[PDB]
Amino acid sequence: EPKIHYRKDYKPSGFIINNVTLNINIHDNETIVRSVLDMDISKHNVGEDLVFDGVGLKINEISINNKKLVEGEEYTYDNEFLTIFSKFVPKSKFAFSSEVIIHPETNYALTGLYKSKNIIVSQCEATGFRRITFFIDRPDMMAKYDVTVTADKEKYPVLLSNGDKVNEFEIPGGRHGARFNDPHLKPCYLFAVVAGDLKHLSATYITKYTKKKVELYVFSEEKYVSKLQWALECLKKSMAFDEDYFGLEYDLSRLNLVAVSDFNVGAMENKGLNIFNANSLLASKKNSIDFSYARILTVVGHEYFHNYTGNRVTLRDWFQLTLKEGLTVHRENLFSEEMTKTVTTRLSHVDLLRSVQFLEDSSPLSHPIRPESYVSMENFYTTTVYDKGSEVMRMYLTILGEEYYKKGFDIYIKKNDGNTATCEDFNYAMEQAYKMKKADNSANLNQYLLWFSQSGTPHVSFKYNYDAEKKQYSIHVNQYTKPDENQKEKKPLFIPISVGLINPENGKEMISQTTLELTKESDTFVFNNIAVKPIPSLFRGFSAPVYIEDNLTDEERILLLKYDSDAFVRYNSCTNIYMKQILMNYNEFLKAKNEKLESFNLTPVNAQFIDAIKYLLEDPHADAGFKSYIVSLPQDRYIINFVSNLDTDVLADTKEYIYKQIGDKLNDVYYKMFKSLEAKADDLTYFNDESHVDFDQMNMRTLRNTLLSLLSKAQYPNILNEIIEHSKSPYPSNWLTSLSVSAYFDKYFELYDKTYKLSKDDELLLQEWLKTVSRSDRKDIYEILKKLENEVLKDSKNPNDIRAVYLPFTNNLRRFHDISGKGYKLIAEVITKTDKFNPMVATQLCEPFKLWNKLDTKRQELMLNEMNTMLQEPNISNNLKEYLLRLTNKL
């Protein structure tokens, strides 16, 4: 083979597009798109043919400077590229015009212009604008847009495109139109249009410094207008945060957010017209689970922060994607951490990175955050680009500190405003701030660029020495990145290591927290006036995206878990104790399986560790959010990073043993806490207020729901009574948990029907119910999936429905990885079926295959057979074919 684009090959276009004037005329069975491109010849032109991207368009006519061009003689069109022969391309400013027909009403791939229920909506990132009209569809082609939309007024009373609405007009035959002018130069991936019978809430915002009045609108279909308020509040918070932290003010008189039901991704930052998966915009406390609130906060914030990091400064080319995505995720993380004031925001992000992203980075799909090549750029909207990218963007803040970070960021945003940029431009701006901080104009960040170009997760390991006579402590540090298919030689990175030192006798800090800068393969950091042997607190806040090998004893880790100040180090110390136990018991079960032993031993869980868990849980003044992290074992996708040829049944046995060891000691504690937390966790303050969320209270419910799961799996005496009462709670997080945990009881199908009836009248709540069933720990899960298919999912093409039914189930370690391969077969069937109408979502459904080469060799073969069968399917999409060829080491 397919067509591969390479980062090194970037060259500017020989053409310029200065203005785009669109007329989009929507009818029931066709949409007519007329477009005039005011174009010119660039200084790079060498007399080449004029080639436009245009995919699946039906040409009515195309013209240059008022004369229609003729197919064969002056142009060719192959359904992908329109080529105008150079002998017919003007040598100076010219107008290119075209009229094409498209069909949003049958566009089930949700790229370009499409119909979502009764809403017409676009999605153009990355390369979708070419599915609407002809363009040089790449992000360095920046232009100004004048867009007119017309439609039946009864069906489509609300018409939106980017920018100021400059005219509204009636049209004979029951139609109407609206015209928009977007004064900000933009690439075409930021174009959007919406038409629908939309309802809204609105507010007026006044910017902090320029005192500009901004009208804020949030839109949904009529049925769900009551679910729009939290999004509007989140938008106001986002605007204030960008003003307060970054000095950045919104730059149009109006900002619209729109929820649609059918959306391939979370949302999209189209200028002045952000469009969202409804599941990331709409919520209400009676019809959404708790996690919806942080999700909406994240996604609204993310899309708002793109207004500068992506829109006002955009991308030279798609290889720079992390420049807007890593940076915008980092901005949203700062925002969400400040808004929630919990440990959950940061720890949740780290947990996702160290599971999903670390898995990706050790898989055949491993790439640097700035990739070197692609076929379908939609396959590179990855956790690597977004989440490792965000950690790389966060490390600049750790290295520079807040003052100089803000200085460097403002250099970047000012210098590149209204223009494209590259990752090097960001590093240059940060380097200017670095020279200031170090008071050294010879200092540079050249080594830092390796975070953009080098793939793989570094491993950072430690050795310690304490001289009690000298009161001198040394931390010897080593870094190593495993060679991979991107680099045979790996180089040392600039790794910032935020550290403290804890006195094990009293739990107190012994030094001012300090950031060590490891730039060599190894280094020794010495500390004087250390009065007693400390326990080091390493990588506070998770200060670099690495595998941490602390070389601490479990006794030392327990002391950090109890007494350290840093939430991440406490949680990581607990994680490391669990991992040591998991690897040991896994090996014991594995040997017993392989050697067909009739009897054998298992290493018990450390009793002092269990005591420490009890100590933390029983502390009435300790944080409920943190507590939920310590009672759960690490995620399977984290564990797999530390085991080769992983047998998933052996791992399931391992985790069950460990959980039962701890529960045998702590179940009475868990039950007492589950009961004692009820009053505050389930208090109804703010239940009618969609402008305020108590994130601490939410973490109390999370803790209760985590404990209830543990007690239910343990068959704690009479816990079904608590489950049934829990099913009567007003909070969906609780009553959906009651379904999950009832899987271990004969009441499961009673609660299945009860909660279905509570969910079925709200589209998003029903999707949450589907996820709850899909992830239920049921021995009959395969028959339950068939029931969902036949009774609820049916023929839906809504990505939220399909993903809800199948993805949670793929994380069922015992069932999805059944040694028959039946789970691999089931999901591959869904992938192949979905690829015939939505290649992006089909490729998303491939997620469970990413770890194929980490499993035992029998499961490797079963997964490879299904992947190779998918690759043989006629008319497989480029998206899915690229993904599977790369994943199977063919590309």
Ligand SMILES: [NH3+][C@H]1CCc2cccc(-c3ccccc3)c2CC1(O)O
């Ligand atoms: N520019 C777009 C591209 C699409 C895309 C793809 C994958 C993930 C995400 C996303 C990340 C965090 C929160 C919400 C959505 C997005 C949204 C986006 O805005 O980055």
Ligand code: NA
């Ligand atoms: Na439907």
Ligand code: NA
């Ligand atoms: Na639907």
Ligand SMILES: [Zn+2]
């Ligand atoms: Zn983004």
